């Protein structure tokens, strides 16, 4: 049982994870075993030639974000480690890299420090360096107006594929690049000239990154200074002439006016390309470059719009159908009103276009046929334009900042077929001809449209195949056991947010359109506050799997006067998963509880306001692997829950007032594998894996003893954060794990 | 100050207010004096004809909710008070009415009950009735399936002017009403058929209420059955014949499809008539009755929207020209697309119309030059629709439940002159021809428009002369000095939850524009989370009085390395008041505290995490009335607060960690009119007017008694909600009032 550190075995190693665990030093209590240790988030100060004795087997040592002053490494502290090959030292408050590092190193990184001074001193001797990232040092101080980059630092490392100066003040290019280079990252350095022979050498390079030189300011986490006149990135016309392996070009935020198509004239496998944030909405009408990049399958002209121009059309260049292998196009923010059929001409043909992004342009009105017209369209992404009814009579220094990363629609929903994404749309109702001339659409968003609409069963006619339906966020009138009933193959529906009418009396509530669904097998009503139904007081599916319910008022219907809602959930045969929380729940009545669904696998009633839990009543639930009551007013065990369940795997108690355990209960429940007991008002104790105690105000006086006997005894028994299990008292030991005390 | 009820003096009579205060019985320690007497929200289950004995001087009781089983009033209970005028036991579970009520009664209000048996046995002697109050009682009930109104129950009644038996299933207009009826309130009573007889009589008759009869079900707070195959109500032709004093007709939710034009036949004076909610598409399109309407001030035809039908056009009849006297219409829901300067001719000559509602229409295009047609239109409320940007050219059974009671556009704006509410409409920036061919705009919201725009200062030169702006609920970049500066005479700014752009470094915060207002006198910058402003690092403004700062990071600004913001506020030389709350502040630097303006008179640094005040730099302002420091950490008074200030009146302290008193505190300070130190941690206590003390954890041991004198000597200041000053010690006290010890025999240990 290891402390501080929980050490696990992964592949073929032993690894030490004591991240955010208040450290004030190394332990020297680390397994003999270890070969990568963790220590990010602690409040280590000093780093020496001792940090690390009786440890020569350590490969991997993160030591990021310490303390939360300054970090102090000596001289030659790691230089004794004979096999480190990963140095994690970011965010230390670093004044210069620090001295005699471990020649068999392979990544280095330095981010988010103070280091001014890129010496031979420092890097010319790690002759093994893959990996070297420098980002966050130079950067906006007053201290240092430059990084001081001595001349052929770098030339040395022959092994270095892969080399990081981004948000640094460079204002050049370093000369004297190793020719092994693969990538190169420069965004936010303020180089604003690049020459014939600044990447001349790097005839390896297969990524580029000059983002956010001169930039085009708009949302960034970071500043944004414009180059004096709003002027662009000047780069020279043969500057990536010898970049012949070039795959990855990053030129957002360098307010490009235009491309000179030279650029790409000897970079035959480009593919993907990165021009968001620049001024191009020329370009992208007449395109020299398009003519360029047959290989390219990711391009990015996002946030190109002239400020204040409304255009009635997007002007996309013929020269776009040369781009024969785009696989994406993600043309969010050029602003425009209307998508006519032929302004997407030249798309129809490229074979592999899978994904649109058009995001953020505010349009209003869409030939929707045109969608058609494509052979391997799987994502329509229009979120945030202005699509009306149809009538017609603090943060990531790693992540990539000018791109969504993240998928443009939930992989839940694309995984069913076509996807199209009108979130955040003004179709505050479905018109007749809303859908009409629309491909198969397997995944359809309408969250946050304004919508507060009463559904006939007639809006989805058009394509009755949606499998995946998101209406979150609007104020939906649930007036008509018929709303839905159009789309028979329907399995996942969420109806989130569209608490308005379910919150009015004047209006009747009908979700008996569930029945209707013989696919249906995830249904999400959270936060809908519903108190009432009318004439079918009870929800019933034999298909459903899943029901959250979370956010609703099961305290008003479970507390009715006529019993009416007493078996609301006991229709829904094949449910497994049910989340009942955030419900205002303070007592259960018994009949109630023995009328959730006997097939239920996963009961989560969790953040409500239970005292009382009548645990005599899982007798009627054997296939409950997990009860979840974390976050209610509990005070009372069972003693006997092996009388109660055979079947119980996790049971989760975290977040209530119980201050006794039973004698037997630890010990007992065969089935129970992991019990939360943390943040409750246990003062001590008196098959399973993992049992969570943190966070309670243990009495750590001889009587804790006999507990601690036990945990030395049942050493397969996970006890997860050991050094958040505190000592409450007596005053001596207030602050101390359980885990410091001795026998005397 | 009487307990357990607070004694007021208000033109030459005592009233007594006990409401919500947890009696369990009517208090027999009231003033004999008294002659109105509130026991509202309390848990009193028994009136006998001793519950009030003596106070013969009493005009008005109010038992309301009481309690929160049911109430059991005695028969001739209040008999002997022979001065009660105004009686009033709403929501009390009474199961009939109190037998043996007085003579001297004008108004009874008896409005959520279980009264299902309206007798002559119990209203009939009442026979200076003016005003009685019967709704919500036979409503929706499983036990009464109609009211028992017993015939001529009310004809005895030869004084009564309003009668309500709204919210109970009538199913027929009871007969034998009084001649003397002014207002008979008829609303939700399932009454379908209205005949010529129902209303006869009822010549002196000024409102009717026949409303949610035969419902349209919209978004009512209470149920909404319609009539059987949506059958309208069936009002027979002369059924309004004799009612020629009628001002107010309200037939909402009624689901009239016509309006026969015979009903306003002999009604030549109806100021306001309320047809929300029904199916009149039809009716304002054609529409015969609107001839007849020629004194009409206040019409309402909101939601008669046909359910899908989103028209390119409204429909409205020549007849609407015909409604001379009108200066309101509320057309709100009919939902259609576009309003062309011709759709809405017949309005252009109505010489008193000042308020058009077009809210909730999903409006596409406006012609706005049609508004520069109209002699006196002070109200343009448009909120609720989609105005694009232009490039090419627990409820209140009393309130009325179908129409917009509070006003469209706030008073504060309308003052200035003429009103455009275009809030919640998708103008997602400001086209160059937004405001071209508009009147001479006062008063503009643009609040809630999904508005993510840079501000060139060259948007509103077309409406330059706007006072009150409203730009809430939008992501504005404050990126440019000019922002607004092309309004001169700007008086009232409003940037409320603009914080979108202020969190982001990547983009410039100007503030700048603010100096260029020679009149602006009110700015509201709450929740914008502003942290770091770009070249200016100081607001500064001659005219300005009001800054609202809540939701910023001066935590940030007042903690900059190069003291950057130590004097953001200095600049603005004329402010009077200023709010520092949910700012995150746990310090103030003397130095920023001391370059607040000297001019302020109410400083509000409420819900910060205070734990320390200098209450020394109060010497640096003489002007000072009222220091709001209310939920922060504080734990230290000054113990010498007159050496400070001769100016501080209010001195807010609530939910702080003051566990002591300075023995010279409450004394001194002859300013001191209001001091609120409820909810700390004062164990004990050992000019002003009023004190809060409730919600303090006191020792109820002997120490206590000091102060409980120093209450019975200080009469004169009120210590509000004493049934709140409660006892957290020692044991056989913790759950009194610190008003209920024995002076004589208390403990002194327990410390
Ligand atoms: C079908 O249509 C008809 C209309 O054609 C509707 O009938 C109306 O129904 C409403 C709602 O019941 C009635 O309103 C009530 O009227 C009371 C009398 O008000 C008048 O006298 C006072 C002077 O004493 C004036 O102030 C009023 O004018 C305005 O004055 C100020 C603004 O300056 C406002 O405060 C008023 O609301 C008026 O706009 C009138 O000339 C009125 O007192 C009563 O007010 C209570 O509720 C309001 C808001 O909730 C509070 O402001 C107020 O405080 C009252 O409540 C408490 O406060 C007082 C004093 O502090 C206490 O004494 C009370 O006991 C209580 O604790 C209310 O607004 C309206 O009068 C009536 N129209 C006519 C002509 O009779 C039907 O309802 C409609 N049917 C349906 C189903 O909707
Ligand atoms: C952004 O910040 C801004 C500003 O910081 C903020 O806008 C202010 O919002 C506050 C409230 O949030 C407003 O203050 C209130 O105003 C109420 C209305 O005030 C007027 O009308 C009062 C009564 O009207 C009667 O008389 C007229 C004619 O005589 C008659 O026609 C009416 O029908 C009616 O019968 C009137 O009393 C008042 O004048 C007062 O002004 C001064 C104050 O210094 C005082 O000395 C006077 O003696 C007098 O009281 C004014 O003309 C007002 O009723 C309300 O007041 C009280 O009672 C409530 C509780 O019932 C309390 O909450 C309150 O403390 C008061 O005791 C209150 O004062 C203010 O007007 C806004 N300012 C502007 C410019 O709009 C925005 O809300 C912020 N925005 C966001 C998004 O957060
Ligand atoms: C300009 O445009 C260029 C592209 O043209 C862009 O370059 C890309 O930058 C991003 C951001 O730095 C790079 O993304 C990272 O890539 C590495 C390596 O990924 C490969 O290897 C892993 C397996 O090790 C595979 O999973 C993956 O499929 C690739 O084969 C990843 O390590 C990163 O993943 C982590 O970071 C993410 C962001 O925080 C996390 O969300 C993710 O969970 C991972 O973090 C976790 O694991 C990490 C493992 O080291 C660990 O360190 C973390 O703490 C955490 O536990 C990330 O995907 C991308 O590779 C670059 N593209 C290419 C082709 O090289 C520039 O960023 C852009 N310029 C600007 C300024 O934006
Ligand atoms: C309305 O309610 C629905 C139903 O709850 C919600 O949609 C679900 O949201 C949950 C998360 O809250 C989703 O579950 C998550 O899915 C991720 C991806 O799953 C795929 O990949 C995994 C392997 O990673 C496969 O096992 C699986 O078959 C899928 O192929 C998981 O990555 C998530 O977390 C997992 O890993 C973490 C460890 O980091 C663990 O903590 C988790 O226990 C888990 O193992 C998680 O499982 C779920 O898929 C969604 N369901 C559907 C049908 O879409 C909506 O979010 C909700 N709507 C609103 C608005 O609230
Ligand atoms: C510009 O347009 C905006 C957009 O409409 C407008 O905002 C509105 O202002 C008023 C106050 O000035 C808000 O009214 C309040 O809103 C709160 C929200 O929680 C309500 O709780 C309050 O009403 C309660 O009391 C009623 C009593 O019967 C209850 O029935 C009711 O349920 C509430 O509990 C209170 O009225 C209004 O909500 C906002 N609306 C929005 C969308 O922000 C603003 O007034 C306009 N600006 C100008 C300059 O006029
Ligand atoms: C349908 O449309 C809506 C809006 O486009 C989608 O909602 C968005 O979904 C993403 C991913 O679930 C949310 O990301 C989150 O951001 C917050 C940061 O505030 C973070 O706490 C979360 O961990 C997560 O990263 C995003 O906020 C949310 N946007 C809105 C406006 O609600 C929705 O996912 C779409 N549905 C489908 C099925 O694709
Ligand atoms: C009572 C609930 O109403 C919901 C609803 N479902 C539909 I189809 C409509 C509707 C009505 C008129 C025009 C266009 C559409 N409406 C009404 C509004 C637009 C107000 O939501
Ligand atoms: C970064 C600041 O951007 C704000 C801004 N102010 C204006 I005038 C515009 C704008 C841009 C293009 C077309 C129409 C209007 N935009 C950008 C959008 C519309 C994306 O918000
Ligand atoms: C460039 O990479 C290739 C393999 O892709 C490798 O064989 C070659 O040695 C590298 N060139 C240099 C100069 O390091
Ligand atoms: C399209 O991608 C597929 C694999 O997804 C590949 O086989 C095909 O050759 C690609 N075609 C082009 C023109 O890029
Ligand atoms: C409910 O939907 C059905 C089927 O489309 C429709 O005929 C009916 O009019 C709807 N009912 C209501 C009350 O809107
Ligand atoms: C649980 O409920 C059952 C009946 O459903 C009842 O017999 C028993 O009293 C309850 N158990 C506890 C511990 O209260
Ligand atoms: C009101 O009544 C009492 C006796 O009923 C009388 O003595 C008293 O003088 C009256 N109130 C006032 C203020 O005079
Ligand atoms: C109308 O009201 C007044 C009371 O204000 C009364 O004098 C008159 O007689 C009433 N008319 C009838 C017919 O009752
Ligand atoms: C218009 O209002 C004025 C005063 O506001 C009033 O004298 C007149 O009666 C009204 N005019 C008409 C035609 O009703
Ligand atoms: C109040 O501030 C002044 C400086 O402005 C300082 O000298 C004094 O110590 C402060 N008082 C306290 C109690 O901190």
New interface residues.
Partial sequence: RSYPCDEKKQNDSVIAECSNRRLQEVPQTVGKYVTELDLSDNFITHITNESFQGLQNLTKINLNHNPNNGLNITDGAFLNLKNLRELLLEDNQLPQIPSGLPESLTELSLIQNNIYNITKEGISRLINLKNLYLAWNCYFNKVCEKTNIEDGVFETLTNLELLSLSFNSLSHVPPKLPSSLRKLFLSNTQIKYISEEDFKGLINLTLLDLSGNC?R????????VPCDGGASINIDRFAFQNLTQLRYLNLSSTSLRKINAAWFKNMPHLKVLDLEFNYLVGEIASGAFLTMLPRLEILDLSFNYI??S?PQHINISRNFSKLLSLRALHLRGYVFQELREDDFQPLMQLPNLSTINLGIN?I?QIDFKLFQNFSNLEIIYLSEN?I??L?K?EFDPHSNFYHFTRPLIKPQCAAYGKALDLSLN?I??I??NQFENLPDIACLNLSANSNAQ?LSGTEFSAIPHVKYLDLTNNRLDF?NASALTELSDLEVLDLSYNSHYFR?????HHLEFIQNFTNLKVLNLSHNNIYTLTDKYNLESKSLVELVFSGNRLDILWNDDDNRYISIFKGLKNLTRLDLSLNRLKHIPNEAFLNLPASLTELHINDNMLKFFNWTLLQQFPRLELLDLRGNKLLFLTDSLSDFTSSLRTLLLSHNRISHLPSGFLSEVSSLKHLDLSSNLLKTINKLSMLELHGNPFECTCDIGDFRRWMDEHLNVKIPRLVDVICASPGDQRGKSIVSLELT
């Fill in positions: 930039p300011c708009f949302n960034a986490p970071f500043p944004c400020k204040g409304y505010f209003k202005r009306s009814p009538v009579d003004s505050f109702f018109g007749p009463v007036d009015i009396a004047g209006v009747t």
